[PDB]
Amino acid sequence: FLAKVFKGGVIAVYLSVILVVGRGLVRGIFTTSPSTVMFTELPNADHLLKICLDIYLVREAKDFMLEQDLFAKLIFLFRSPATLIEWTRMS
Amino acid sequence: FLAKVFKGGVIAVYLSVILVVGRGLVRGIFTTSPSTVMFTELPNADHLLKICLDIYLVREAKDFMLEQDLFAKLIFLFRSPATLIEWTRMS
Amino acid sequence: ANRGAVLKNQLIEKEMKEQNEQQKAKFNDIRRRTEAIRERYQKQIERGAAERDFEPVTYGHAKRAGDYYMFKYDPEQKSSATRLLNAVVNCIGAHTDILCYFFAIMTQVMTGGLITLPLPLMSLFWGNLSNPRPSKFFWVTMITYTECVIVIKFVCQFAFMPYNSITWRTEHQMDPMSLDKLFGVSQRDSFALWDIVLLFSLFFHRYMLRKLGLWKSGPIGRFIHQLFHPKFRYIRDLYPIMFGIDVICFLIMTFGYSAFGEKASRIPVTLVVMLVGMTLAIIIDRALYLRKSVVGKLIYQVLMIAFLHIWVFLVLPNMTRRSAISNHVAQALYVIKSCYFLVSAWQIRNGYPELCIGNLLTHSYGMTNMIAFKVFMNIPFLFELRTAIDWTWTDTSMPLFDFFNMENFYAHIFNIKCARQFEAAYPAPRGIPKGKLVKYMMGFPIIIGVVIFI
Amino acid sequence: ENFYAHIFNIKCARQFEAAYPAPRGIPKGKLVKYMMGFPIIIGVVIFI
Amino acid sequence: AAERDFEPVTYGHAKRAGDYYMFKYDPE
């Protein structure tokens, strides 16, 4: 079944798929951008996990008034990096 | 026209295209990275819009000397997050 | 000593009693915890009342009310084999009731027809849903119908029946809806065993209840009232078991496709239509569990079981042109779904728990939880569907995209916490250079895989 | 140009949010949830 | 020495010991 239009054919699609797999799949999951490292390298996530569990609990307890306030608190914590690093300090 | 090489064929490309569409297209517009929320959740963009309109106006008025300074001001505003949140405060 | 069982009743009303106490605690802590944080908030707005600007009125202004002031505080005889034997004996003794139902289901599966069908119908309609220990007449009527069906099968298994002759069997060996096959009685040249097993298990259950001493206006309304309002009830959550069962049901459903067809190379449109029906059933079950609707779940179970029985035992052989006996894939499908029906009926009978959870993937922070969460997130079109069904069938105070953002934030935080816990579990040396063996068996696989892929 | 695009999009979203007020912490109604949830699930199932 | 918290023992605690105190000097 050879000679299936071998005019720069299967080799081109092979190179294209190799390039797209190398650039998109393995590269993205293998290394991290310098913007991400500031979020990934938190030394202690106990406080953030406690806040998220607390907002889940207050949502469950049918107290939607405080859920919005806790979400705003989390948004502000994730916005300002100084407050994030201060809040994430170990012990 | 069946049996068009059904040796793990059409199902493989179908799974691959489903996976690539799910990972790339829908997921990206579906959720947001924690790095992006720092910029998307500005409560008041009036000042930034005014600065950009002013730099457009000064470029139109043939005053390229101040356009570079305004661009530097915008770059510094987008660099430091504390100045950004301070400048973006409501009212 | 037949009296000596009624004393058990007292410990029963003690058992629920103590768990009721836990329920009280499981409430009281919440009624403190919530108000506790409220007090903290009441402190913060009092501390920085001269710094905040603007008053949050709308929800958009509420999301963006964060400021520095609210963060200005510090965050602070005896053998193991004997034990297993005793456990399994106790489990069998306490679960003969469901063992009999399983045996009836199996003897329906491998004696397919309209002669045994009343046994699964009664088992999965009357006794299974009967909250207060189904009465004696229930067992007696399955007894009577059991000897009736076995005697009928034996007398119809004689050789002078017209359908038992060789010529008739040869002429009607490929028709999936023949008279004998429809009635459920045929040659059965191998053996008939599981009917005997079911009958003897049912007699053993009768003997066990006799030893225990429980053998001795609008009846349907009374039954419904007893089912909905039991004087004794427990609090258990079994939704993950149902999810596992119906996911493996989906897996065996989609992996075996030729069994539901027949050339037979073309995949029929019926396959995809039933497949979409199964997906809709999964979504409906999730919605009913999330909304805590007992009546809706009961109606859904009744309609689903009736539809499945009619479908499998009437119309599937019509499409597939194969006998129901020789359709082992459908047999396993029916057995698994019947087990799911048993679990769901148990859940309906014992009611719904008052307190749910966030997800059964974040209660513990270990390697297993990390792997399960990673594989759950990596597969596409799974996180999105669940995160939409949440906020589609639950009450919150945030829009859809905000719910998505909150779920993503929780996922990231849980992943970081679990990674930190794993790192703490396995200590690292004090700046000692990495060993050669770990470097070797973490470096060679990567290079080998890359070269192989290229 | 990219910065102006982002800023204009944020401003227009803020203006749209201000145009349609939101309730004071009231839980979302059932109807908006229904015709914002069913279309997404139906579309996802159809796509799959 | 009066500002730092915790003592780095394992590798994870050493990699994330960054604080402001050691950046309080001119680069030249």
Side-chain angles (χ1 to χ4, degrees):
Chain A
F1 277 45
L2 213 54
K4 61 178 72 66
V5 180
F6 194 50
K7 283 295 218 174
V10 176
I11 206 64
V13 65
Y14 153 75
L15 266 183
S16 296
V17 74
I18 279 297
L19 178 76
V20 73
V21 171
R23 285 298 309 274
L25 182 163
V26 63
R27 166 71 57 97
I29 195 66
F30 201 111
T31 188
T32 187
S33 178
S35 188
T36 300
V37 62
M38 162 204 98
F39 277 129
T40 300
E41 294 293 328
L42 306 158
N44 197 352
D46 290 332
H47 298 122
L48 266 52
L49 197 52
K50 168 202 162 195
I51 296 169
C52 184
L53 281 183
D54 186 74
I55 191 167
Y56 264 119
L57 188 151
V58 67
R59 166 193 303 165
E60 170 81 27
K62 302 295 186 291
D63 197 32
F64 308 93
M65 201 36 48
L66 294 175
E67 183 178 1
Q68 294 178 357
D69 269 319
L70 290 166
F71 191 85
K73 190 177 190 177
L74 183 59
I75 284 284
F76 185 84
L77 193 39
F78 262 60
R79 175 184 295 151
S80 179
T83 317
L84 173 59
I85 184 56
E86 194 285 345
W87 208 251
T88 307
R89 175 161 310 295
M90 179 152 287
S91 86
Chain B
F1 283 60
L2 213 53
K4 61 178 72 66
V5 180
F6 185 60
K7 283 294 218 173
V10 176
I11 206 64
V13 64
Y14 153 75
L15 267 183
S16 296
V17 74
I18 280 297
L19 188 153
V20 73
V21 172
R23 285 298 309 274
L25 193 161
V26 64
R27 166 70 57 97
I29 196 66
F30 196 107
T31 188
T32 179
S33 179
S35 188
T36 301
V37 64
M38 182 179 72
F39 285 122
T40 300
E41 293 293 328
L42 305 158
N44 196 352
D46 290 332
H47 298 123
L48 266 54
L49 198 53
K50 168 202 163 195
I51 296 169
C52 184
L53 281 182
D54 172 285
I55 192 167
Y56 263 120
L57 189 151
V58 67
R59 167 194 304 166
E60 170 81 27
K62 301 294 186 291
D63 197 32
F64 308 93
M65 201 56 28
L66 294 175
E67 154 180 67
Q68 293 179 356
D69 269 319
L70 291 164
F71 194 87
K73 189 177 190 177
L74 184 59
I75 284 284
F76 185 84
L77 193 39
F78 264 70
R79 175 185 295 150
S80 179
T83 317
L84 174 59
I85 184 57
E86 162 62 47
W87 208 251
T88 303
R89 186 179 296 276
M90 181 155 288
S91 86
Chain C
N2 205 47
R3 184 291 311 181
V6 301
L7 61 86
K8 293 322 152 183
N9 177 27
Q10 283 80 17
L11 61 83
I12 302 294
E13 53 86 22
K14 178 42 59 173
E15 273 284 337
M16 61 79 71
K17 166 56 52 183
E18 67 183 1
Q19 76 87 1
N20 184 25
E21 205 46 77
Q22 331 300 338
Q23 292 303 91
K24 179 70 205 72
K26 215 212 281 183
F27 269 47
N28 201 14
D29 190 359
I30 296 170
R31 257 181 317 282
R32 292 183 291 113
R33 272 180 74 87
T34 299
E35 62 86 20
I37 65 169
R38 169 161 313 193
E39 294 293 328
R40 300 296 297 163
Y41 182 76
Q42 199 39 250
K43 169 68 160 40
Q44 280 319 303
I45 199 155
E46 277 170 337
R47 207 229 53 75
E51 158 175 339
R52 81 292 183 276
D53 277 1
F54 194 70
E55 210 74 23
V57 171
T58 188
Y59 164 72
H61 298 161
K63 289 175 70 176
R64 282 80 57 85
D67 189 358
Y68 295 130
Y69 73 96
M70 41 205 298
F71 284 85
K72 204 166 277 306
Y73 72 102
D74 68 279
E76 293 177 350
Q77 171 86 8
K78 306 308 289 178
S79 314
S80 64
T82 61
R83 296 152 200 162
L84 277 296
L85 189 151
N86 296 344
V88 300
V89 173
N90 296 329
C91 282
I92 299 299
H95 296 309
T96 60
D97 187 19
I98 63 170
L99 177 75
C100 182
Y101 302 147
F102 177 66
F103 278 149
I105 290 307
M106 201 65 148
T107 195
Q108 180 65 41
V109 175
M110 311 187 316
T111 299
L114 281 293
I115 192 167
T116 303
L117 186 65
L119 283 74
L121 268 293
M122 300 164 135
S123 302
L124 302 196
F125 274 9
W126 173 9
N128 192 358
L129 304 188
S130 277
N131 211 301
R133 204 157 34 244
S135 67
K136 168 186 44 67
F137 179 47
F138 170 67
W139 298 127
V140 175
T141 188
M142 291 180 182
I143 301 299
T144 297
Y145 198 86
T146 293
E147 311 98 330
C148 190
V149 66
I150 190 183
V151 162
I152 285 163
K153 273 180 93 53
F154 164 66
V155 65
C156 294
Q157 266 165 347
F158 263 120
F160 64 93
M161 294 298 102
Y163 47 80
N164 196 1
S165 66
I166 302 310
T167 294
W168 189 103
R169 167 260 200 177
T170 294
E171 293 278 351
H172 293 275
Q173 54 93 19
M174 71 195 318
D175 291 331
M177 281 295 78
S178 190
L179 270 293
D180 62 356
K181 289 186 174 176
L182 169 64
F183 283 160
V185 63
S186 66
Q187 293 82 17
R188 311 319 291 240
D189 61 357
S190 313
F191 196 52
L193 182 63
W194 300 68
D195 209 305
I196 315 300
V197 159
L198 165 75
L199 173 53
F200 267 96
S201 179
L202 183 61
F203 271 32
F204 187 34
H205 182 89
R206 195 279 281 270
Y207 152 77
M208 191 95 68
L209 274 69
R210 152 184 320 277
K211 173 154 138 191
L212 183 63
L214 276 297
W215 181 245
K216 65 179 73 174
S217 85
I220 61 170
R222 283 185 265 154
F223 175 56
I224 289 296
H225 163 80
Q226 277 165 354
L227 189 154
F228 272 20
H229 288 123
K231 54 212 151 173
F232 290 62
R233 97 187 316 157
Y234 300 127
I235 303 292
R236 289 228 208 282
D237 204 333
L238 293 177
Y239 186 81
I241 297 195
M242 291 145 67
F243 185 70
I245 291 175
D246 63 358
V247 175
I248 62 170
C249 181
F250 176 84
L251 291 203
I252 62 170
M253 171 145 187
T254 187
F255 272 20
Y257 70 102
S258 51
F260 296 92
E262 183 178 1
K263 202 59 66 149
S265 65
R266 182 180 64 83
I267 60 170
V269 66
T270 179
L271 188 152
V272 66
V273 69
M274 81 217 6
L275 185 63
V276 162
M278 156 65 53
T279 306
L280 294 174
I282 305 289
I283 287 154
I284 285 181
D285 195 322
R286 183 101 161 81
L288 293 174
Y289 158 71
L290 183 63
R291 283 301 301 171
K292 294 182 184 293
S293 165
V294 192
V295 188
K297 193 150 200 44
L298 159 68
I299 292 293
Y300 163 89
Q301 183 178 2
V302 164
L303 276 71
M304 185 64 72
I305 190 168
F307 171 73
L308 182 159
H309 289 171
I310 301 299
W311 159 268
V312 175
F313 284 142
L314 267 285
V315 65
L316 197 53
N318 265 22
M319 289 153 211
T320 190
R321 293 290 87 192
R322 298 158 77 160
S323 297
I325 297 91
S326 66
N327 192 359
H328 310 82
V329 168
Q331 303 182 339
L333 174 78
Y334 174 42
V335 167
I336 296 289
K337 186 64 66 68
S338 189
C339 275
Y340 160 65
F341 278 151
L342 292 173
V343 165
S344 160
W346 193 103
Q347 177 79 5
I348 290 174
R349 193 163 40 97
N350 295 114
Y352 263 120
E354 183 65 26
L355 282 72
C356 302
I357 55 189
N359 217 39
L360 188 153
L361 291 172
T362 53
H363 283 343
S364 66
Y365 313 109
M367 288 305 249
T368 66
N369 287 39
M370 180 167 318
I371 296 294
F373 183 76
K374 274 292 223 197
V375 65
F376 165 66
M377 301 265 298
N378 272 6
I379 170 170
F381 294 102
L382 193 49
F383 174 71
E384 293 179 353
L385 264 183
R386 182 246 186 189
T387 304
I389 294 161
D390 287 0
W391 182 92
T392 300
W393 275 282
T394 188
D395 49 335
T396 61
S397 167
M398 294 182 286
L400 181 60
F401 296 142
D402 286 342
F403 203 87
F404 292 164
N405 181 83
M406 151 65 58
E407 287 329 285
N408 178 243
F409 283 3
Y410 180 41
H412 195 177
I413 295 317
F414 159 69
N415 177 266
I416 300 299
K417 171 97 187 78
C418 185
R420 285 302 107 75
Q421 199 82 328
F422 155 69
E423 185 267 352
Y426 279 33
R430 182 46 256 167
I432 301 299
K434 284 289 210 190
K436 304 314 276 286
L437 61 83
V438 63
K439 260 179 209 154
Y440 280 147
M441 293 183 286
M442 185 179 288
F444 286 103
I446 284 284
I447 313 156
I448 292 310
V450 161
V451 167
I452 285 293
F453 182 76
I454 295 170
Chain D
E1 287 329 285
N2 178 243
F3 283 4
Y4 180 41
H6 195 176
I7 295 317
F8 159 69
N9 178 266
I10 285 307
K11 171 97 187 78
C12 185
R14 285 302 108 75
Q15 200 82 328
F16 154 69
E17 184 267 352
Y20 279 33
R24 182 45 255 167
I26 298 314
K28 284 289 210 190
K30 305 314 277 286
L31 61 83
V32 63
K33 261 178 210 153
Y34 279 148
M35 313 148 277
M36 271 275 267
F38 286 102
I40 283 284
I41 313 157
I42 292 310
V44 161
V45 167
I46 285 293
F47 184 25
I48 296 170
Chain E
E3 157 176 339
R4 85 299 180 270
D5 277 1
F6 195 71
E7 210 74 23
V9 171
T10 188
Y11 171 57
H13 299 160
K15 218 175 67 162
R16 282 81 58 85
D19 291 331
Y20 297 129
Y21 74 97
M22 62 205 158
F23 283 85
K24 204 166 277 306
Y25 72 102
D26 68 279
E28 293 177 350

